[PDB]
Amino acid sequence: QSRAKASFDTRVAAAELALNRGVVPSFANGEELLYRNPDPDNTDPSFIASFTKGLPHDDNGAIIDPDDFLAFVRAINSGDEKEIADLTLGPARDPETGLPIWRSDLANSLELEVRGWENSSAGLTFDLEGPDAQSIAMPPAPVLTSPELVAEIAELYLMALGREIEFSEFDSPKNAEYIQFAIDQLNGLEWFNTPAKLGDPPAEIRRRRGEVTVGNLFRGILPGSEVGPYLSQYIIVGSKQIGSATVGNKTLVSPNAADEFDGEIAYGSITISQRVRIATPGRDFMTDLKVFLDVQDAADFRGFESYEPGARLIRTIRDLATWVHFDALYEAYLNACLILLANGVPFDPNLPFQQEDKLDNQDVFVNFGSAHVLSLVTEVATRALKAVRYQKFNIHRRLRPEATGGLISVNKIAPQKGESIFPEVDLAVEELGDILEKAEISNRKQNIADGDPDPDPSFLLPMAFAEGSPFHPSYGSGHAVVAGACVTILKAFFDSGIEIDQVFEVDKDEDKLVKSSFKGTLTVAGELNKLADNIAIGRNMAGVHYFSDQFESLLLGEQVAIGILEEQSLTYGENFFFNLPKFDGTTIQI
């Protein structure tokens, strides 16, 4: 037939393949309407567990008008520009200046404007390649009263309290007090110490972490993530630099070969420096109730974080949080791909033309080569983002961990003033005694630093970012869905089973890479999974995500990437398949 007709038929076949995968129904946890207004004469839902950031809130962190949230949900489901614009975003405005009236003096003195919701209807956006955003479902998010949410808040608060703690020094004596405190606190939670029960949903079983040790503290459950150093090699190490190539028998060494261990990626003929901008140590955000409420009322605090001069390789938890703050969508993965290409990590052996050219007579650049994997790793990201945007806005609308911390703080402060509010987080508040006391001490220190000589006690989750979380619900995670999708693309495309000869850790004292003491072997697949969950738990480290968000959106991203790979496999006449090890330990051939 005609080439144009063949192309149309291939595209229609890809669309049909997407259609026949079927739509997995997306069930939420029912938190949206199950929590009601505590006022006896008000039977309206409180929407405390729902993402209500941007909607006006009362002094306790709940929305004054549930109709605002209902209009927000209607705008999410419709996607119309006008209906979104008709939403009430932020607090009441000044009649004269037109500026929103902020509770915190900081947001008022800055004359902060409101910030809109980030792509509330991107989940309604179709995609021409890969699964539809609404065809793949995440499991219901943990409920506020569940031990899973309590453990997620505990781990979030422990990371927030341990932001200035180096990854290479998790087992170091200097951090031992905090690390043992966090391990004991997590192991004192039903979610971690008690295993999953029979009859629980399979996803809840899969994402339930066991006993928390220093080896797996703040680590993901992806294979190869608890094994080796914390940070993936591709997030801290550079790559074989330009000029370090094997030409026939002689092996030319690049004059800049030290840049590989200096965290410099061979980005074409220029370099990507793996060193991250140093956010100011010990400077948490959204630790004061007024500032937190303003941020919940859409106070545009973006870019208000201060940074130290220069850049350094990710050493502290705050460094990883800063890294995931600004990463350009697929940046972690794109950098991982660039390292793998520059390091000469072989593509998947089942890809065509991967043999020596004396055998196949074919280099691979456009198809099954560097350009192919770069394009796939950077194009899976937006499809995964659309899927996760659907999950965030249209299905779950889960409140961000800062909002959960606000509920916890208000609930804990209520007995001080003699009242009681948010019994839905009572189990979390009682379970996390010492965690919340340490968080209160750190928050009081931060609020004194902010300029309050005698701040009210605050148990808010310390935020690594001034704006806190982005303006989207926490379930799922855009960063972790892109992590899952892009790392799946890389593991399928590259020889993911290739062992990594040199395992590096960031030095304990100096901003440099040192040969890690890890005596085991790290695979490319394991280190890519480690990179994916490094991004995911960096989002957790910022206080913007719970662990279940990260794991389930990593699974969603893997589904996105697998679907995209199946649809692209119809476009190649070459006899080949991608050898993709999934996050559950199995391998799918695409």
What part of residues 229-258 is at the interface with a copy of itself (CB under 8 A)? 241-250, 252, 254-256
CA separation for the pair 409, 167 (Å, rounded): 28
Flag whether 103 is marked binding.
no
Q: Which of 353, 572, 576, 577 binds Ca ion (CB under 5 A)?
A: 353
Q: Left (φ > 0), alpha (ψ -120 to 50) or beta: where does 362 sit? A: beta
Q: Least distance from C-beta 17 to a copy of itself, angstroms?
A: 10
Select from 359, 270, 287 the least CA-distant residue to 106: 287
The verdict on 382 binding a copy of itself (CB under 8 A) reads yes
Bridge partners of residue 463, in order along the sequence: 285
For residue 358, give the H/E element and its range.
Answer: helix 357-360
Q: Least distance from C-beta 16 to a copy of itself, angstroms?
A: 7
CA distances to 64, 277, 536, 547 from 325, rounded to whole Å, are 30, 10, 11, 17
User: Within its chain, how far is the Cα of 259 from the centroid?
Assistant: 28
What part of residues 264-283 is at the interface with a copy of itself (CB under 8 A)? 266-277
Q: Least distance from C-beta 355 to Ca ion, angstroms?
A: 5
What residue 128 binds from a copy of itself, Ca ion, none (CB within 5 to 8 A, per partner kind)?
a copy of itself
The verdict on 178 binding a copy of itself (CB under 8 A) reads no
Bridge partners of residue 413, in order along the sequence: none
Among candidate residues 57, 372, 396, 472, the one labeled active-site is 472
Residue 267 or 577 having the CB closest to a copy of itself: 267
Flag whether 290 is marked binding.
no
Flag whether 116 is marked binding.
no
3-state helix/strand/coil string of 30-91: CHHHHCECCCCCCCCECCCCECCCCCCECCCCCECCHHHHHHHHHHHHHCCHHHHHCCCCCC
Q: Which of 199, 310, 453, 585 binds a copy of itself (CB under 8 A)?
A: 310
Residue 467 or 552 having the CB closest to Ca ion: 467
The verdict on 115 binding a copy of itself (CB under 8 A) reads yes
The verdict on 303 binding a copy of itself (CB under 8 A) reads yes
CA separation for the pair 13, 565 (Å, rounded): 14
Bridge partners of residue 36, in order along the sequence: 45
Residue with tokens 């129904």: 25
The verdict on 112 binding a copy of itself (CB under 8 A) reads yes
Q: Which of 44, 113, 169, 507 binds a copy of itself (CB under 8 A)?
A: 113
What residue 124 binds from Ca ion, a copy of itself, none (CB within 5 to 8 A, per partner kind)?
a copy of itself
Flag whether 474 is marked binding.
no
Flag whether 353 is marked binding.
yes
Select from 523, 579, 588 the least CA-distant residue to 559: 588
Select from 430, 398, 463, 392 the least CA-distant residue to 144: 398
Q: Least distance from C-beta 368 to Ca ion, angstroms?
A: 9
Burial letters for 398-425: b for 16+ Cβ neighbours within 10 Å, e otherwise? Answer: bbbbbbbbbbbbbbbbbeeeeeebbebb
What residue 309 binds from a copy of itself, Ca ion, none (CB within 5 to 8 A, per partner kind)?
a copy of itself
What part of residues 555-574 is at the interface with a copy of itself (CB under 8 A)? 567-568, 570-574
Residue 54 or 406 having the CB closest to a copy of itself: 54
Tell me, by CB under 8 A, how many residues bind a copy of itself.
144
Flag whether 357 is marked binding.
yes
- Reduce the DSSP state of residue 260 to 3 states and report it: helix
Question: What contacts 24+ positions apart, CB below 8 Å, involve 6-14?
Answer: 10/570, 10/571, 11/128, 13/570, 14/129, 14/567, 14/568, 14/570, 14/571
The verdict on 443 binding a copy of itself (CB under 8 A) reads no
Residue 346 or 451 having the CB closest to Ca ion: 346
Which residue stretch of 32-40, 110-118, 441-449, 486-494 sits at the interface with a copy of itself (rule: CB under 8 A)?
A: 110-118
Which string of x and - marks every residue 4-43 that binds a copy of itself (by CB under 8 A)?
Answer: xxxxx-xxx-xxx-xx--xx--------------------
- List, in order, residues 6 or more apart from 161 with CB less than 8 Å away: 178, 182, 435, 438, 439, 442, 462
What part of residues 355-414 is at the interface with Ca ion (CB under 5 A)? 357, 360, 362
What part of residues 65-84 is at the interface with Ca ion (CB under 5 A)? none
Torsion of CA 8, 12, 15, 19, to 10 degrees: 170
The verdict on 67 binding a copy of itself (CB under 8 A) reads no
CA separation for the pair 572, 566 (Å, rounded): 11
Q: Least distance from C-beta 375 to a copy of itself, angstroms?
A: 4
CA separation for the pair 399, 469 (Å, rounded): 10
The verdict on 261 binding Ca ion (CB under 5 A) reads no
The verdict on 304 binding Ca ion (CB under 5 A) reads no
Q: Which of 308, 434, 509, 584 binds a copy of itself (CB under 8 A)?
A: 308
> Exposed (0-12), middle (13-18) or buried (19+): which is 42, by Cβ within 10 Å?
exposed
Bridge partners of residue 276, in order along the sequence: 312
Residue 164 or 426 having the CB closest to a copy of itself: 164
Q: Are 306 and 283 within 8 A, CB to CB? A: yes
What part of residues 312-371 is at the interface with a copy of itself (CB under 8 A)? 322-331, 338, 341, 352-353, 356-371
Q: Least distance from C-beta 522 to a copy of itself, angstroms?
A: 22
What residue 35 binds from a copy of itself, Ca ion, none (CB within 5 to 8 A, per partner kind)?
none
Task: Determine whether 396 is an active site residue.
Answer: no
For residue 356, give the H/E element and its range.
Answer: none
Flag whether 79 is marked binding.
no
Flag whether 355 is marked binding.
yes
Task: State the amino acid at position 504 in one-letter form.
Answer: F
Catalytically annotated residues:
472, 479
Annotated binding-site residues read 353, 355, 357, 360, 362, 392, 400, 477-479, 539, 545
Annotated binding-site residues for Ca(2+) read 353, 355, 357, 360, 362
Annotated binding-site residues for vanadate read 392, 400, 477-479, 539, 545
Interface positions with Ca ion (CB under 5 A): 353, 357, 360, 362
